[PDB]
């Protein structure tokens, strides 16, 4: 069938992706006891918005489980699927027919229909009309609690909704559980991001020159993304924190938007990850600005290394993810005192949870349409209140077709060292003579794109990580 | 004093602009006398947002009101102006001190005076208690419909705001008009957003090949905007318009891609513009994608360059803009009379409002802080209800520090000329053996970016022109 495609070399993504979410989707629900048959899930698709007042347009990005479901990149759009027969249908706007000036063709429903392989294609002011002939019990509407941002999903509203039955609260568990496992089409298009932004990824490793601002290597890494990988928008935000600003866990925002000179002995952290066709990936990158690790920065660096890859070894169906954030935490404890910035019982480091006072964050989320994905914390699944831990966002146990960041980090965070050298009880563990040398280090993070399998993880990731590799990328060898 | 700049060869705009701004909507509201003595103006800026209900963090611009006030690049503020002594202060997010965290430094009210050059800055929880320390008699605040967009202003609010007299009319127009008419400060950042995107418009035409996709080019445009530039946004989605798609006024959004594979013979038509520091910059490039024009393309890129160059030598102070319109129309409708694609009396064509199947857009529009600035229709100036004309986004008469953009263009639209041969009033000046050969030509566009002086235009954009630089430019000259 259809394919979506940017040309060139870009990735060719069956639309028969979205037809075996949609498929996956009613099979799950059609074993949910609560679910009446004659259901029809309804959805609706993002709309074309404008900066504040203006009639600046902003660039249309789908809403995630829309896209998830039908793959559509037009706004003003609703999608239904009669859960029984899986049969599914796609509203699309009346476009006046004196409309062919300003936007482009004005499509027929055939030409919608063909694209995106649906069953039916209908405009979007008849889908009361629609929906009411085809007699549906209830409609299965969106409207739950993203555990990550706390917002509310935007549940499907029309002109006479009003006259049907309505249940907003069986379709989000569900639809959200589907979405935590990748099927075999969803893996190949994150493989293919995770392609395109590791070699962006060493391209800007290459790229990185004393003297250069942070958001040229930004530039860079989007202009590659774009132009080699068709991924017109980045999956977040680009982190490209440079010296201190590797230290900081919320930078290149607004209000520290990577406009800081990259200065010889700085380390870099850029954590910078392309989007194609609503796909995420999200890699770091951590190397000396100058192409050579200093023992300090080695030390660091290569803790970091070994909690990434001690993680990825361990990872395999029914590992507890905080199990592995524990275990990073213990192995950067271990090469913390190696190094001789901690003294003492790592063990009794360990108790008094001293590890996040180097990783504040959690160890590593769900990646799919979104980069913090859905599902971490269904119900039943519980946050665990402890420092470092109470930052993850899933507490779940792994299963196959899980798609997990892996993204370990030591960080040197003054508010935090100073509160630790404050309590008593984690104080005596720190050589305060030799952690001075490293107020103002910055941060070291490695960020890789794992999927679960039947018997451990697929590394989707490939960039340079050891000493070696980075230096020979960076010296351009 | 102090000046926003992104380092290397990007322009260093000085707080100062943001000041005198400040100073001459009070000045203007001083001379209003419906304005009350101990009147403050309330201003609420952006607050940061995310993609849908995820926690995907939207990349934050300030709204374009409290831009033009304060210059302040964080979300979440609030800017006040005491009319009468005019005193500024804003009002920032108040983090907790556990955000250091995840944020590094959380900078002090100091740190924002100093950056800012305001005269007091408190926290935004504190707002109804220092203005009720203040004694207004009534708190001036921003609302009224933008003219292109048919949106409402938002207007600010706050905890406590019903305990105060407020006033949502009177501000509107005086900031809109403050805003139609630029400082010297303010020309100096519009003459930069030009010259880098002027740049960046010279390096696509010596990039472009046969047979790249077109957002290649918006791709290369945006990162030497960035790069170079300092040029986070775009002042609107680039449009890349090849072949047919150069008839197609705002291609590129999400539903027509910039998508499309360049080829031999195909007419370009580049509409882009870098955005610095929130000031606009909207340039329009039309060029053959192989670097060298036929003899049609040439005929009608020299038409457009005629109407171009007469429309910027007529504009003065007293020149009323739809004159300019006109102007453009009829000398569009003399030169494909003499390249024998109509025939007849131009008079007559004009009457019959030939003009506006080739050129259904105005022909231009107040640019500023924003692409399509505000100001263009103020109470009293009335839309002026004929083909072309009505899509007009100003119809005043010039006043020197206005700055416009001058973009004829001729376009070969189907459904525009198929009316127009339907159409006994207008088909008899067709001649269909000549027309043949231009359907499916797409279109030229070329748009400047001027400054209305005390006697003339400045011209802002720096690109080749005639057929001699385009070829020249494109030939790596
Ligand atoms: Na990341
Ligand atoms: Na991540
Ligand atoms: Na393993
Ligand atoms: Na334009
Ligand atoms: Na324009």
Same mark, same amino acid.
């Given at each position: 069938?259809?394919?979506?495609?940017?040309?060139?070399?870009?990735?060719?993504?069956?639309?028969?992706?979205?037809?075996?979410?949609?498929?996956?989707?009613?099979?799950?629900?059609?074993?949910?006891?609560?679910?009446?048959?004659?259901?029809?899930?309804?959805?609706?698709?993002?709309?074309?918005?404008?900066?504040?007042?203006?009639?600046?347009?902003?660039?249309?990005?789908?809403?995630?489980?829309?896209?998830?479901?039908?793959?559509?990149?037009?706004?003003?759009?609703?999608?239904?699927?009669?859960?029984?027969?899986?049969?599914?249908?796609?509203?699309?706007?009346?476009?006046?027919?004196?409309?062919?000036?300003?936007?482009?063709?004005?499509?027929?429903?055939?030409?919608?229909?063909?694209?995106?392989?649906?069953?039916?294609?209908?405009?979007?002011?008849?889908?009361?009309?629609?929906?009411?002939?085809?007699?549906?019990?209830?409609?299965?509407?969106?409207?739950?609690?993203?555990?990550?941002?706390?917002?509310?999903?935007?549940?499907?509203?029309?002109?006479?909704?009003?006259?049907?039955?309505?249940?907003?609260?069986?379709?989000?568990?569900?639809?959200?559980?589907?979405?935590?496992?990748?099927?075999?089409?969803?893996?190949?298009?994150?493989?293919?991001?995770?392609?395109?932004?590791?070699?962006?990824? /060493?391209? *800007? @490793?290459? +790229?990185? $020159?004393? &003297?250069?601002?942070?958001?040229?290597?930004?530039? !860079?890494?989007?202009?590659?993304?774009?132009?080699?990988?068709?991924?017109?928008?980045?999956?977040?935000?680009?982190?490209?924190?440079?010296?201190?600003?590797?230290?900081?866990?919320?930078?290149?925002?607004?209000?520290?938007?990577?406009?800081?000179?990259?200065?010889?002995?700085?380390?870099?952290?850029?954590?910078?990850?392309?989007?194609?066709?609503?796909?995420?990936?999200?890699?770091?990158?951590?190397?000396?600005?100058?192409?050579?690790?200093?023992?300090?920065?080695?030390?660091?660096?290569?803790?970091?290394?070994?909690?990434? /890859?001690? *993680? @990825?070894? +361990?990872? $395999?169906? &029914?590992?507890?993810?905080?199990?592995?954030?524990? !275990?990073?935490?213990?192995?950067?404890?271990?090469?913390?005192?190696?190094?001789?910035?901690?003294?003492?019982?790592?063990?009794?480091?360990?108790?008094?949870?001293?590890?996040?006072?180097?990783?504040?964050?959690?160890?590593?989320?769900?990646?799919?349409?979104?980069?913090?994905?859905?599902?971490?914390?269904?119900?039943?699944?519980?946050?665990?209140?402890?420092?470092?831990?109470?930052?993850?966002?899933?507490?779940?146990?792994?299963?196959?077709?899980?798609?997990?960041?892996?993204?370990?980090?030591?960080?040197?965070?003054?508010?935090?060292?100073?509160?630790?050298?404050?309590?008593?009880?984690?104080?005596?563990?720190?050589?305060?003579?030799?952690?001075?040398?490293?107020?103002?280090?910055?941060?070291?993070?490695?960020?890789?794109?794992?999927?679960?399998?039947?018997?451990?993880?697929?590394?989707?990731?490939?960039?340079?990580?050891?000493?070696?590799?980075?230096?020979?990328?960076?010296?351009?060898?």
């Amino acid at each position: 069938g259809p394919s979506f495609w940017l040309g060139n070399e870009t990735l060719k993504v069956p639309l028969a992706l979205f037809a075996l979410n949609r498929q996956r989707l009613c099979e799950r629900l059609r074993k949910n006891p609560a679910v009446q048959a004659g259901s029809i899930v309804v959805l609706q698709g993002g709309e074309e918005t404008q900066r504040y007042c203006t009639d600046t347009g902003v660039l249309f990005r789908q809403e995630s489980f829309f896209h998830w479901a039908f793959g559509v990149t037009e706004p003003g759009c609703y999608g239904v699927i009669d859960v029984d027969t899986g049969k599914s249908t796609l509203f699309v706007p009346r476009l006046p027919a004196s409309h062919a000036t300003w936007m482009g063709k004005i499509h027929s429903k055939e030409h919608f229909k063909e694209k995106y392989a649906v069953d039916d294609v209908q405009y979007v002011d008849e889908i009361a009309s629609v929906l009411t002939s085809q007699k549906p019990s209830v409609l299965l509407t969106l409207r739950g609690v993203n555990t990550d941002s706390g917002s509310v999903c935007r549940e499907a509203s029309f002109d006479g909704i009003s006259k049907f039955e309505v249940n907003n609260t069986i379709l989000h568990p569900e639809i959200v559980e589907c979405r935590v496992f990748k099927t075999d089409m969803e893996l190949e298009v994150l493989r293919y991001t995770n392609k395109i932004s590791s070699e962006a990824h /060493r391209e *800007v @490793m290459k +790229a990185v $020159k004393v &003297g250069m601002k942070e958001y040229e290597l930004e530039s !860079l890494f989007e202009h590659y993304c774009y132009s080699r990988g068709g991924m017109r928008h980045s999956s977040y935000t680009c982190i490209c924190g440079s010296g201190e600003n590797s230290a900081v866990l919320h930078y290149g925002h607004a209000g520290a938007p990577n406009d800081r000179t990259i200065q010889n002995g700085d380390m870099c952290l850029f954590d910078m990850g392309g989007e194609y066709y609503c796909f995420a990936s999200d890699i770091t990158c951590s190397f000396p600005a100058n192409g050579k690790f200093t023992a300090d920065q080695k030390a660091v660096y290569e803790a970091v290394l070994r909690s990434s /890859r001690a *993680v @990825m070894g +361990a990872m $395999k169906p &029914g590992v507890w993810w905080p199990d592995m954030h524990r !275990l990073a935490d213990r192995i950067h404890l271990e090469e913390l005192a190696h190094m001789g910035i901690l003294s003492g019982s790592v063990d009794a480091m360990v108790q008094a949870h001293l590890g996040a006072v180097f990783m504040p964050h959690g160890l590593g989320h769900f990646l799919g349409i979104d980069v913090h994905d859905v599902g971490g914390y269904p119900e039943g699944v519980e946050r665990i209140d402890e420092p470092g831990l109470r930052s993850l966002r899933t507490a779940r146990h792994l299963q196959p077709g899980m798609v997990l960041t892996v993204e370990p980090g030591i960080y040197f965070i003054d508010h935090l060292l100073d509160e630790a050298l404050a309590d008593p009880a984690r104080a005596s563990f720190f050589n305060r003579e030799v952690l001075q040398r490293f107020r103002g280090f910055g941060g070291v993070r490695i960020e890789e794109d794992v999927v679960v399998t039947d018997s451990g993880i697929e590394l989707l990731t490939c960039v340079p990580r050891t000493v070696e590799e980075i230096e020979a990328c960076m010296a351009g060898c």
